[PDB]
């Protein structure tokens, strides 16, 4: 009999959604409908409007109005709605859903211009929001937020919110002005997309928003983009009688509170990029913040469905005509490049863009190609982490569009140092495209002069093959093994041949890996099953860390002309425990990989290795979390396993760092003794990579503060390095 | 909690108003709890290495079983992709299904599971 509960949830949403009638009528109509259904049970229409208040920000103003019309028809409704709101907000903060909580605050605020909440009533709490910046021994992050929650609402509620407490909103201003200037900015460098202050400065979020409020204040709190549904409802809204928000005291900081990490605004567009057409709001104007905040919110909702998401985006409310295409794209890349991590999964953006191009063939294409060009051109100061993502995106994007690109536009890189960003880009790009197809196809799609930066071929390197260098030890052992594998030999039949080898055995390994990878070099299918069949041989040969390292050494020596292969193997190698994480670490930081140390695949692996470690811990955490919820000597077994699962996880990061400091201080003291430049293409990558570790796996790392802080990153450490650790700390402080 | 919960691309039924090839949940049960997707309409010369790259951008893969011909024993035009957890599986289904591989639109669907003998046309 809940057919009424279904129709309602529908009618609620159906108003914000497009229609063949004015938004006013839909709200007016929806009014009597819901009102007519209050005696005929309220509770639902209550828990409904509250949801739209949080999970449907992009439709903010529209639902605040609905709630308005209801107020101006039933005082007692708005009073139980606002009674609900705060309580909801009171639950959000405790669960630490600050991103969501700001949506409420922004709603409640708007309600003030809807004759529902008392103009002063809201400033009352807003004062308490700013008053937390006075609290002692509490992470800056908490402070930054409450200030965020405020300032951000103001582009809405402030126009009519300054007809009052302008006596206090001059106080709250100066109080937020002081704290704003007394805030450490340690993070910014680790969070910037580019380091170039030109042509678009990457500004801190709160340091940028303040610049958008000021433009508002001096413009008398007058904006030109937020649609007010209640402009044609002033007549019915005035006689409505506002409500009072009881005293609000922000939940005290506890060792159980988690606050949003600081963010740096992404800026790559201004009105001059698009000359002909509508004028894009300025970087410091509020409009811009508005559209961007809403677009981020549009994809926040319908990301799961790329097809719908396109439309919801292309058909945005935009009060004053804006250049949506550039705003859309700019917001996508803004998310894709969002350091540390994007809000969604990288691949999602790739596909979405493709959908957009399908939806608007006439406009979106041209822009994207213009955005690519720009992104490339500014490459030099771009942060590596973003670069990878860039490289990862485009290639994929090209694979859906017959690898068609006017490369000759980037003919400027051919005349640059290979270690330089721009050319390095095209390189890593093509290299990835090959894997999406085959090495030959790439040679036909690129210009003759770019042939140089083209991918090496996936040629296997068999040290003991057609090599006439018989002067190499264990030469025959491999040849005998060779025939052994071909004849369907077993482990014991393979041990036999190997027992007759001269010298953990450096040589016995070499002749094994090399030989098995050569007959299994054809496909990924063979190489695996091979590793699997003679798994016992592997696990016997590499029973030491020195051996586990060697395996990888030879393997690389064999497939150094085929990364994807190197990657897939290391993966399957650890999953079957033929090699562990620690080994792959000392291998990634080994002298054999120094000439490739800056190439993508390298770190890709290192991360694969890490994720697999990260996933491992979590699993054993859930298997123990489920176990306890119930012979049980299983819990003893698991508990003991968690201990070991973490221990190895700690060691991992401990290694990746210790080694990272080793190859850094090594370069810092070098350019100091010779007097050479520190900013080397290799230093850039190396140093920022150390940053990428701190950025992707921050969550876990915080667990070794006692160790990192006092042991691995102390004063004596060069400032350029320590900087990144102190940066990393700026996220949770 | 609303109609934004919808997942049209991962929806598990493709409600075919046709008779019988999926009626009892004795199977269906496995469908919605699967991590292996049936990928169909690949290029006759599409390699394992290639599929690996593409389907890994939506999460770590376990094993790819290349579709073969019960007669000619070669690329029949499909394959099966088994991820480690449904999470990554839904993504590929959400973002990879319908995109291009070796210059063609590949359609992916949910599969109860891989059994031996299923790789023959």
Curated annotation (Swiss-Prot), chain A:
The modification Phosphoserine is found at residue 178. The keyword Isomerase does not apply. Residues 5-217 form the MIF4G domain. Component of the cap-binding complex (CBC), which binds cotranscriptionally to the 5'-cap of pre-mRNAs and is involved in various processes such as pre-mRNA splicing, translation regulation, nonsense-mediated mRNA decay, RNA-mediated gene silencing (RNAi) by microRNAs (miRNAs) and mRNA export. The CBC complex is involved in mRNA export from the nucleus via its interaction with ALYREF/THOC4/ALY, leading to the recruitment of the mRNA export machinery to the 5'-end of mRNA and to mRNA export in a 5' to 3' direction through the nuclear pore. Keywords: Acetylation, Coiled coil, Cytoplasm, Isopeptide bond, mRNA capping, mRNA processing, mRNA splicing, mRNA transport, Nonsense-mediated mRNA decay, Nucleus, Phosphoprotein, RNA-mediated gene silencing, Translation regulation, Transport, Ubl conjugation. It comes from Homo sapiens. Component of the nuclear cap-binding complex (CBC), a heterodimer composed of NCBP1/CBP80 and NCBP2/CBP20 that interacts with m7GpppG-capped RNA. Found in a U snRNA export complex containing PHAX/RNUXA, NCBP1/CBP80, NCBP2/CBP20, RAN, XPO1 and m7G-capped RNA. Identified in a IGF2BP1-dependent mRNP granule complex containing untranslated mRNAs. Interacts with PHAX/RNUXA, SRRT/ARS2, EIF4G2, IGF2BP1, HNRNPF, HNRNPH1, KIAA0427/CTIF, PARN, DROSHA, UPF1 and ALYREF/THOC4. GO terms for biological process: 7-methylguanosine mRNA capping; alternative mRNA splicing, via spliceosome; cap-dependent translational initiation; defense response to virus; histone mRNA metabolic process; miRNA-mediated post-transcriptional gene silencing; mRNA 3'-end processing; mRNA export from nucleus. InterPro entries: ARM-type_fold, CBP80, MIF4G-like_typ-1, MIF4G-like_typ-2, MIF4G-like_typ-3. Residues 608-656 form a coiled coil. GO terms for molecular function: molecular adaptor activity; mRNA binding; RNA 7-methylguanosine cap binding; RNA binding; RNA cap binding. It is found in: Nucleus; Cytoplasm. SUPFAM superfamilies: ARM repeat. The modification N6-acetyllysine is found at residues 181, 641. Transmembrane segments: none annotated. This is Nuclear cap-binding protein subunit 1. The lineage of its organism: Eukaryota, Metazoa, Chordata, Craniata, Vertebrata. It holds the Pfam family MIF4G.
Swiss-Prot record, chain B:
MRNA binds at residues 15, 38, 107-111, 118-121. One of its GO terms (biological process) is regulation of translational initiation. GO terms for cellular component: ciliary basal body; cytoplasm; cytosol; nuclear cap binding complex; nucleoplasm; nucleus; RNA cap binding complex. It is found in: Nucleus; Cytoplasm. Disulfide bonds: none annotated. Residues 35-113 form the RRM domain. Changing residue 41 to A: Does not affect mRNA cap-binding. Changing residue 38 to F: Does not affect mRNA cap-binding. Keywords: Acetylation, Cytoplasm, Methylation, mRNA processing, mRNA splicing, mRNA transport, Nonsense-mediated mRNA decay, Nucleus, Phosphoprotein, RNA-binding, RNA-mediated gene silencing, Translation regulation, Transport. Changing residue 15 to A: Abolishes mRNA cap-binding. The modification Phosphoserine is found at residues 8, 13. Component of the nuclear cap-binding complex (CBC), a heterodimer composed of NCBP1/CBP80 and NCBP2/CBP20 that interacts with m7GpppG-capped RNA. Found in a U snRNA export complex with PHAX/RNUXA, NCBP1/CBP80, NCBP2/CBP20, RAN, XPO1 and m7G-capped RNA. Interacts with PHAX/RNUXA, EIF4G1, HNRNPF, HNRNPH1 and ALYREF/THOC4/ALY. Interacts with SRRT/ARS2 and KPNA3. Belongs to the RRM NCBP2 family. This is Nuclear cap-binding protein subunit 2. It comes from Homo sapiens (Human). The chain holds residues 6 to 126 of 156 of the full protein.
